[PDB]
Amino acid sequence: AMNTVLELQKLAHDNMLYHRYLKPNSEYYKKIEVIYELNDIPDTYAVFLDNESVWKHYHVKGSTLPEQGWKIHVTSSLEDSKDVLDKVARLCIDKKIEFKHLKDKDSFMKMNSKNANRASSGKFITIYPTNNEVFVELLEMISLAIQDFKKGPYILNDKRWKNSNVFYRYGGFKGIFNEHGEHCIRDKEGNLIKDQRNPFYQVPDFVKDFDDYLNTINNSRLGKYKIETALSFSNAGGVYLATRKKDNLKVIIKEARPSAGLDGAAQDALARQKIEYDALKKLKDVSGVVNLIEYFQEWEHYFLVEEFIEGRDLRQWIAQEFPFFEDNNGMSNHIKDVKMILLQLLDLIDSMHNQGVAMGDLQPANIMVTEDLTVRIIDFETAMPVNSDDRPAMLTTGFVSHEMKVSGARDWFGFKRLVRYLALPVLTSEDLEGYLQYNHLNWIKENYGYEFYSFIVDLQEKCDKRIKDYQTFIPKEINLNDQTSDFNLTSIINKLIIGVESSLTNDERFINGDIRQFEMNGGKFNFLTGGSGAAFTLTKNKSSIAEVDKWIQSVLLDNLPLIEEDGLFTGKTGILALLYDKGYKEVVLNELKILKDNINQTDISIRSGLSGIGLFVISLYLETENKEYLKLAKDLERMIKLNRAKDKQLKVKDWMAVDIGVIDGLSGVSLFYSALYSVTQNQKYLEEAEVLIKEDLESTKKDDVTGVLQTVDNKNRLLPYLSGGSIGVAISIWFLNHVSGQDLYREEMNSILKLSKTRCTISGGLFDGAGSFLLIPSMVKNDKNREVILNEVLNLLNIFLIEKNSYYVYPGQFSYRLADDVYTGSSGIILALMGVIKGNPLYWLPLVNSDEFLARTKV
Ligand SMILES: Nc1ncnc2c1ncn2[C@@H]1O[C@H](COP(=O)(O)OP(=O)(O)OP(=O)(O)O)[C@@H](O)[C@H]1O
Ligand SMILES: [Ca+2]
């Protein structure tokens, strides 16, 4: 009965962090800041919280507990949290039992949110019995204490004790780590077994018999369908593709787990599902709205069965159908398809509102298009009555405004933004829309022509009219002539520099940057997102010397020894390049002595691994003719060799890293080999360089219509970008050729350069967006061909480049906020543009005396 429901969680299947950084009324990424106090705590307990984590520990006396064993987890609903911890803790205290709980409301929310890990979900209190006897004792006593409480979210990783909120599992009591994996437990033999935390209960081999014991005293409306696959999982439940048996109707089954998957409004899976069901009933006769089949409870979960709509959501449609490639004259078909979709969508929103319901999240993900471009809307979990001025549970940044107050108005605003989006699929937030509205409309007009432009403006104006019926709303003026593109590279560099100069933080970060300034180690100080990137870039432009010197002297130097990673982009080495150029020779020489020691190990990437470090080391060897640095480079090479022999498969730490290309993949490793060749003349390093590129080229795909080569990842995604994409591959080919005097991979090179024909990218940044394309002209030696390529990518840059006062600034990832870092902001754009001037496709690398590096590594 219940085993069938739970098994659903086992089936196979096929950036949200930005929200936490939209502190209102800032133009930058800035954290939004947000309590289980218990009293009468005996002195036999020590009470502390985690370094950076969710748990408040209650450690008893001076006892030692086993390093693994049978542990108890307790679950509670949010409204019952304080009341459940009171009864549970004051039991454990009064029995001298070690336990922990989630430290505050925020933590509870984070761990039980819609997108929280399914394994970790529901675990509010963790209890650590000293041995198996007190374990089984506690099962009964805790459950006796909490019986008169509402059932909380089921913990998918545990077995439940009877019909209580008491759950149990065997795993690590402490965190026991290894060299290739996470949390582990000990065996009876080769004690290296991995602690399994999955969305289903599992038992370590060597304690099965005790689980067998535990099972002793431990006390179909859905069988109508063949549940084929799971389209998606969240903490709130699964969404499954099914076929109704003896009928063969494809349906969508949407699962809600009671008390699980909270949102910002503290609404659970069931609360949202009911809203979706109510909405779909009210819209039974609106043919554009997906139709509900049936609604039933099976075991404890609730199941909303739904028409399966054949086609693609507008995100997929955009990705696959938008005419990204400039093939010379031919965007008229797009114009046709966009009009047909949008005019359908206008009528659909009117129909929904006529029935008194706003859909609540009008944005590409929820709009589907059939093969003949019929428009349907799915996902009514966000539905509200039109006219309601309730705070929405969720906002899709990119298609919302805080200026919207009424639910009906929110739909029209999203549509309004959707209208321009299909014409230029480039994300923006309300915070930068003030600026980028000009960039986008100007682009649409120059590229589609006045007719289509006026279709867009008119339709957006009708949206305005629609909003005005719901609330007071009066949008700003137009006048597109106020915004002009720039095609003068020096001008763009100089104005972006003034931009940076005008946005210095007087804090430890030096500049505003990507959220990774906050989310990652060294992020405030390193080259990638930290102040070293900007300070380096400003130094190259002889700008802000006094400000740079002060940040170095008073922040960077005291932080340098304490940055634990040596990574080129993420850690010490990138910083040391800045330091050397700035004259701090003594400081650099000292850090180099430590460098052979600490963490010369498994990561080989340019970003954070041995290649990047080695590449820095080689650059330092070229600058100082100190042979110890060549020796060290050689040592790093052998260690890369060792790593490759242990296993070819690369590990990614960053959620946007892909194990191909120059940043995180083998193409990057080849840069180091190429450079090592330049300084040794050892042919063998040249061979390795070439072999590494070859291996990456195996993960590329040529389009048949367009001639463009891109990389293809492990989810069949095509990539152009410097990070993960073919432009980075091209750069390594270029450098291979630069150091050897050859012209290898001419064919691949030529088909990568064709990326300069790209009309738009969803984001603007050097690594993951438009800025990547600025690297293309820097790899073209012929002046005449360069000029055409440069103009094309400058058209692309001008979609992102913001005029603010009389200087330029640059949007960060997804253009939600501004950034001035190398990774996403103006610093990386500057370095790439300076690269174009200098014919240098490596100029974005923090190498020692980089203005000399090409000349010094030339064949
Ligand atoms: N009625 C339907 N017909 C066809 N596909 C559907 C239907 N309802 C949902 N889907 C698709 O099933 C998948 C999972 O739906 P779910 O609501 O869980 O979205 P999700 O995983 O959060 O994805 P997204 O990031 O697109 O919101 C999505 O690709 C969604 O578009
Ligand atoms: Ca959805």
Author numbering: -29 to -16, 4 to 23, 29 to 213, 223 to 862
Task: Quote the original article.
The kinase domain phosphorylates Ser or Thr residues in the peptide substrates.
The most suitable fusions consisted of either seven or ten residues separating the leader peptide and ThurKC, hereafter termed LP-(GS)X-ThurKC, where X represents the number of residues in the linker. The single-chain LP-(GS)7-ThurKC fusion yielded easily reproducible crystals that reproducibly diffracted to resolutions beyond 2.5 Å. A preliminary model consisting of ∼70% of the scattering atoms was used to phase and build using a 2.15 Å resolution native data set collected on crystals of LP-(GS)7-ThurKC bound to ATP and Ca2+ (as a surrogate for Mg2+). There are two copies in the crystallographic asymmetric unit and continuous density can be observed for both polypeptides throughout their entire lengths except for segments Asp(−10) of leader peptide to Glu2 of ThurKC, residues Arg24–Asn28, and Ser214–Glu222, which are all presumably disordered. First, clear and continuous electron density can be observed for the leader peptide corresponding to residues Met(−22) to Asp(−10), and this accounts for all but the C-terminal ten residues of the leader peptide.
